[PDB]
Amino acid sequence: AQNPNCNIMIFHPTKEEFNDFDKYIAYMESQGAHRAGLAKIIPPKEWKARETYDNISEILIATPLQQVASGRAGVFTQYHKKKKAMTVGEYRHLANSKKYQTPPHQNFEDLERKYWKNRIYNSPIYGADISGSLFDENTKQWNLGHLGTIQDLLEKECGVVIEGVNTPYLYFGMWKTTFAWHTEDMDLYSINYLHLGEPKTWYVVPPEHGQRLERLARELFPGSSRGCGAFLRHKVALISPTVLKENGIPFNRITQEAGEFMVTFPYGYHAGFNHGFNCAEAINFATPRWIDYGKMASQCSCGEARVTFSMDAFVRILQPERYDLWKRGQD
Ligand SMILES: O=C(O)CNC(=O)C(=O)O
Ligand SMILES: [Mg+2]
Ligand code: NI
Ligand SMILES: [Zn+2]
């Protein structure tokens, strides 16, 4: 069995290997990359996402989210308070202000220590989940707006035609902006490209050990667990690496820098934070290996998780028994 310790693998495809996206994902999995839940892909040196980032300041962040924490430094939840619209140029200036900027630090490790010590005492503003793309239309390789759609994969594998679309999303971050512990909708893959700015640190649990994380989360967030049988779908809970290590939960960490891709694999729980002002683009995707994970994915039916239009068909076809109750949650 390849990669039996479930380490995060880093790949360096040649420009020839960068042509066929599906084939490269299948190659990474042949080497055991999926066992980690997360892989890094460094693009060939000849590749570029677009020519420059000089003209992005007028993008609108319609609903910036202030991420307010509750709990203790290593075990907390966050809620998203909606703020007034602002442009990317206004958000960058905010991120660089004395109130919000990255503090002086020695290296990524020192910054990670400061994040876990002090995150809860601040409420950074995240420009998350903005439909759109920063890939130039002429970028032919690994262009996250030109991938094969999940609906087309389901049709090719299972023979059923369904409604729905699959488009990318932009994330504009600042110091301490945080993504809570989660797997993707319907335990899909994700791919994330860091277009510009400061790094993003990731934590991940191997898919084969995901239920260990869920059992810890039920212990640590006991009221939330009573409220919903899949409350990590709410995407609000954080647990630090120190707490994970104290509780014997297998995990790994890695920092993504500008110009690098990350792939998350089906049922790979992940969480993390931004180092300073940045912009990432991400989208969900599927492969034939996903289908069996989709069929078994947990679902929130309490009503909190509320998700896209296109998830309806995935539930309806892959999880017909759950459909009824899940749809109640969304309606
Ligand atoms: O970048 C972020 O804030 C969160 N991204 C993801 O969870 C992902 O790409 O799957
Ligand atoms: Mg612009
Ligand atoms: Ni994710
Ligand atoms: Zn729920």
From Swiss-Prot:
GO function term, MF aspect, one = histone H3K9 demethylase activity
Q: Where does Zn(2+) bind?
A: C228, H234, C300, C302
| Name of the featured protein | Lysine-specific demethylase 4D
Naming one, the record's GO cellular component terms include: chromatin
The UniProt annotation places 2-oxoglutarate binding at Y126, N192, K200, K235
Q: How is it modified after translation?
A: Ubiquitinated via 'Lys-63'-linked ubiquitin chains. Deubiquitinated by USP14 with the help of TRIM14 leading to stabilization.
Q: Which organism is it from?
A: Homo sapiens (Human)
UniProt main location, coarse: nucleus
Concerning its family, UniProt says: Belongs to the JHDM3 histone demethylase family.
Q: Which UniProt keywords apply?
A: ADP-ribosylation, Chromatin regulator, Dioxygenase, Iron, Metal-binding, Nucleus, Oxidoreductase, Transcription, Transcription regulation, Ubl conjugation, Zinc
Q: Which GO terms describe its biological process?
A: cellular response to ionizing radiation; chromatin remodeling; double-strand break repair via homologous recombination; inflammatory response; positive regulation of chromatin binding; positive regulation of double-strand break repair via nonhomologous end joining; regulation of gene expression; regulation of protein phosphorylation
Origin, by domain of life? Eukaryota
- Cite the cofactor comment: Binds 1 Fe(2+) ion per subunit.
Q: Which cofactor does it need?
A: Fe(2+)
Positions binding Fe cation in this chain are H182, E184, H270
Where the record annotates domain JmjN, the positions are 8-50
